[PDB]
Amino acid sequence: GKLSLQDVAELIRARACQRVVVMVGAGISTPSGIPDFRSPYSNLQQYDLPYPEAIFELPFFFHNPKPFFTLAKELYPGNYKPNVTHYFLRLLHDKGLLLRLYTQNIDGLERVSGIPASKLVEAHGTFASATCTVCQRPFPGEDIRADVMADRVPRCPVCTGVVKPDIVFFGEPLPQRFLLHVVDFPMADLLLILGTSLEVEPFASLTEAVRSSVPRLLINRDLVGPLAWHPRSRDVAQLGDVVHGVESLVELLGWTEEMRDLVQRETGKL
Amino acid sequence: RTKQTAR
Ligand SMILES: [Zn+2]
Numbered sequence: 001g002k003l004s005l006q007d008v009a010e011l012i013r014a015r016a017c018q019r020v021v022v023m024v025g026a027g028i029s030t031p032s033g034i035p036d037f038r039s040p041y042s043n044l045q046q047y048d049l050p051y052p053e054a055i056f057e058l059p060f061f062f063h064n065p066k067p068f069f070t071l072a073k074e075l076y077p078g079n080y081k082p083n084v085t086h087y088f089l090r091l092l093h094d095k096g097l098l099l100r101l102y103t104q105n106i107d108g109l110e111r112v113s114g115i116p117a118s119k120l121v122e123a124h125g126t127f128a129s130a131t132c133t134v135c136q137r138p139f140p141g142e143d144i145r146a147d148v149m150a151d152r153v154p155r156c157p158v159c160t161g162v163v164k165p166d167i168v169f170f171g172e173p174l175p176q177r178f179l180l181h182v183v184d185f186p187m188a189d190l191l192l193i194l195g196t197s198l199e200v201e202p203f204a205s206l207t208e209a210v211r212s213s214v215p216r217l218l219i220n221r222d223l224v225g226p227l228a229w230h231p232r233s234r235d236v237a238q239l240g241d242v243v244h245g246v247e248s249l250v251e252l253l254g255w256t257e258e259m260r261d262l263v264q265r266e267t268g269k270l
Numbered sequence: 271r272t273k274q275t276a277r
Pocket of ligand 1: 132133134135136137156157158159160161
């Protein structure tokens with residue numbers, strides 16, 4: 001205390017930190033073109049939302065599911081590519097430093113970036129599976145993909161109700177895979193928080209779940225959530241553009257060449 | 271423990 005971005009970089013280079021847990025939000029996906037309703041022509045005006053969080057609210061969805069399924073349509077195919085923040089996390093995995101990446105994003109960029117599903121916790125759900133909003137019948141996500149791409153609201157062939165992809169809405173429980181945090185966060189010897197306002201629970205509360213000895217690096221536009229309210233001696237904030245913060249850390253780590261090579265090959269293949 | 275906004 002106080003620790004600096006260079007101190008964290010030197011911990012990773014010394015392999016003093018080998019078990020990095022990462023928490024990311026819509027911050028890391030904006031460089032890729034994907035909107036963030038907390039920001040920014042307005043993302044809300046474009047998606048016709050009284051307020052931002054409405055798009056992931058069941059009451060609003062039942063009144064009008066079109067904004068949600070517009071966003072769903074944009075995200076399904078490879079319309080968007082991973083940016084340097086994704087590839088940084090991929091490189092963390094390639095070097096055997098990533099314990100787990102917890103994401104609030106449903107853009108599937110983490111996977112595309114080449115992070116195995118075993119290393120991912122898609123805490124706010126996935127398009128891979130769907131559920132009837134009335135009769136709770138499960139479906140594979142592929143069934144409703146065609147309907148969503150063709151601008152049709154998918155309906156239950158049993159109950160007649162609206163079938164929704166397994167994106168966690170406000171009021172819904174998180175996927176069971178979220179419970180992996182109970183094992184992961186006590187084991188973490190470094191926590192990275194990238195591109196999140198930590199405005200959504202119980203995801204935000206995970207920042208508190210690491211041992212007090214563990215540095216918490218925030219790379220974000222501004223100091224936020226528990227890290228603002230309940231700081232600790234070994235917290236580091238690199239406030240600014242998330243991609244700038246990441247590239248700064250990459251340079252301090254000495255990975256800039258390796259990153260440049262990785263990003264070129266991987267963006268070549270898309 | 272379900273999805274809700276913080277504070
Ligand atoms: Zn049904």
